[PDB]
């Protein structure tokens, strides 16, 4: 059925429309239902038997076994028909050398052998088809299971450090695929034992008791292999672990690369990554050594068994083997060797699949979530640690009114929102929803999908243009969407163009405002926005747009100024509600709280590269040693054939030495390919990481994180664990096939003729496959990436998926995507099997031609002996060549990144001319600075001239987009400085090597970036600082008491992204990280964006007292903060409108500073 599609590949590239829809019984829906029923039946037995964990294996079996039984039936028939070549060759040799007389005609037996071979190949391929069908069905079912699990796991699992979003991505990408491949190969595990045993029985029939000796030597494969497997298992587990850890670090390095670079710590984190990589490579080396030992055993136990059998026969049966007995025995030994070719692969994949299924079982047994709109009574909600973060929560969110939940950093605002939404463990009390009706949740950390602006804003609703315009204008996104490549259809989020923090937060708030649900939980919508955007959003989006619909709005804001427009105020302190009521009620009951609020408001070449990565000697050793090994093997076969055909101590001794050489060469050839693979993997990963780290920040901003992290994650896996086995099998099969053809052509010269036409045939089929395959390959890739993406974007932002209660829609989307990917992979496998079947028929034609040529004298028998195995090893050559082409494509992907640009770290000034303490006085002097982020972009900064005196506190304030951050980054030479000079303390910063300009200046970015590890690791990765310095910095940052009360102490774990602390606490950790460095110039960029007014006030006072001598330049979120500063530089569209003292610019009425101050 494929033939037509393959030939159509030329005229019309095969697309998903040329490809058909998946059958009814192959859809992910039905397979998922079946597997879920089986897994739940296994679960039922967990309660009956103590510690009886549900086994994914028995569920898989109950759901998809019978197809595997049919496949194994086909494989058994394939083996029984494969035990026909022995008889046919024996009869051919008997008759050529010389009603049961018609049958002995060598030509009749040649025809029968051809028929038996084609039938055997047909049955083997039928087994393969059934198995790949079952394996694809099972991959679909398991993806659906893990997805419906992701939609139920508790957020505490990711927040408390149990698992990582990266681990789930890894599950989906790698581990299910490995299980699928093992299932593809699984029938061998019970078809190879049967075949080898049956062949040993027939060897007993032919030779006699002698065969039993060989039989014993064959059975030793079973213990040995088992042992090997165990060790491999261990190694693999270790590998996995380290890999995970390493990737975690890599991921973080790629997300926080801007902070690492600005702090000059890039190399330290890179070195930690490299150490974890060294551990992973040690694990992989153990794995590879045991793989090579596996290959040695599988290839040498045949040789030793042959030696033992035939020497035992030489010294047991005085009667010599007649030529027919000899060739029958040698042919049976070849039939035994054939299954042992793939034994290494099956044991390897079975071990890896056992490990992957352990991981999948663990993940499928993880923790899962359990006029007043919402009335909470006596709630003690906790965040999974058994320690109540909210205690005695008594709240009432009145229907159709505005509830503002206000408190200082870490008072349970987001915690209370997620408690009402039910994402955190309940310990007492109840939440009454006058059974959660869908609530539109704007999370503190905005979560954007990979779709367009429009798709993110609508988010599962019909496009009502009136509502869309109203929302997009209330959020003030309209001036921002048009500047994008495509107005509203531009791709947002990861795998698309990256918006600024304010833009993304406003997309999130627009999404929340658009959905037609009765309740809207907005969590800190006014953090990234400046005063103008926030005020517009409040005055239109919340006070007007959401009050026309009478929707119940719950606002989590640090902006006390907006409290005057609130109907209900919930004041939070230390996880409890101090006071709940109207402004007047709080004024009467809690006088001091109202007074405090008032005070606060102041009121291929890739293949050659891979082979030669090992120094040009491992390639030579591999190829030469393999050639000599196979020379010895052919010599052994010829020795047996001739010695037994002609019919002594001489013969025994010669055969013994040949077999010993064969075993030694087996060892030598086994080690080479694995050593090559290890060397290449090490070199490739080292180069990739080094070149990524040293890249310019522009490269990271322009390119999606997806591509780089995909390289590191899943291309290194291919280079490590998939290229070496494929290459080894390719080389062995190709040598076997070339040697066969050579032996046949030397025995029967005329065979050369048949070789050329058939060769042509081979060529053509390759050609056709190699076009169609590629097309289908692309489809596979193009279908698989969205799928993974979906998983990712549902794992991250799960609270939003389950706050809007759009779980069903997302489940259906996943089902659709997995069905499409399954169609793609099914037809890729179909092209593969088309090629394999055509090559099998080509091989059968070779067997027939060689047979007929030989029939019309021991050399010509050996010719047929090899003709038989041509059929198997040609198939293997072709399959492995295709796989190797794909994996060399992966190698190409890795090698592509080695031509990136590098930041010019060298610099011009000799390090001697740079004083030991360069920023001593800390006197910045900007002269006519012009700055554009990338080449050929309008100058974000134009003609900036300012002179900051030593110890002159400077404020910078302007509308969002005035390039204040561009100056902040210009001090560190990240934005390209076309013209002008920033002379800091006597040295032009353009000359200094970057690691002296980045190292001696400290910046606090608005976005908090916390790296996984201890608090100590995030405050100083170098571990130089004394504990007292860390405590000093934490006290300045107003986080000393919380860390004192943290369990671990100053070693308390900080889960990935600092998710176990509130956003404000993350920002304060960043402030402390900047404070430890004790540099002389401190550029704080909106450092108090997420910090409430009280903590902001006290922290500003303390940071000003402690860093009085240093020069601090603060880009102010509130212009009120920098009113008391010696110098104030107000930017407006890249130009400094005025540069004077605070009081002077304030005195001049109708000025930009005075305007901002008045507002
Ligand atoms: C030698 C002839 C007769 C058959 C060739 C293959 C067989 C020897 C069978 C019998 C024992 C089987 C092996 C014994 C058990 C394992 C370990 C298994 O991994 C584990 O058991 C997990 C590791 C652990 O036990 O801790 C992977 C399959 C494998 C290699 C089996 C693969 C197929 C084997 C080698
Ligand atoms: N995802 C989380 N998992 C576990 N514990 C958390 C998580 N988020 C916060 N906490 C804990 O909750 C305590 C209170 O933080 P909370 O989540 O209420 O912050 P918030 O007040 O909403 O944030 P902000 O300071 O931005 O207003 C913090 O001490 C932190 O230990
Ligand atoms: N990573 C970037 N790459 C290229 N251009 C940028 C980048 N970030 C900001 N810009 C541009 O620079 C201008 C000012 O941005 P920014 O420096 O963030 O202002 P702010 O003072 O609000 O930080 C914007 O109008 C935007 O077009
Ligand atoms: C049985 C082991 C000896 C060395 C006696 N013979 C082999 N070993 C292999 N491989 N013969 C062979 C040749 C070509 C293709 N397949 C098998
Ligand atoms: Mg909050
Ligand atoms: Mg900014």
Author numbering: 230 to 327, 341 to 612, 665 to 728, 744 to 912, 975 to 1018, 1028 to 1236, 1241 to 1543
What does the paper say about this structure?
ATP-sensitive potassium channels (KATP), composed of Kir6 and SUR subunits, convert the metabolic status of the cell into electrical signals. Functional KATP channels are hetero-octamers composed of four Kir6 subunits and four SUR subunits. SUR subunits are not only targeted by inhibitors, such as insulin secretagogues, but also by activators, such as KATP openers. Here, we present cryo-EM structures of SUR2A and SUR2B subunits in complex with Mg-nucleotides and P1075 or levcromakalim, two chemically distinct KATP openers that are specific to SUR2.
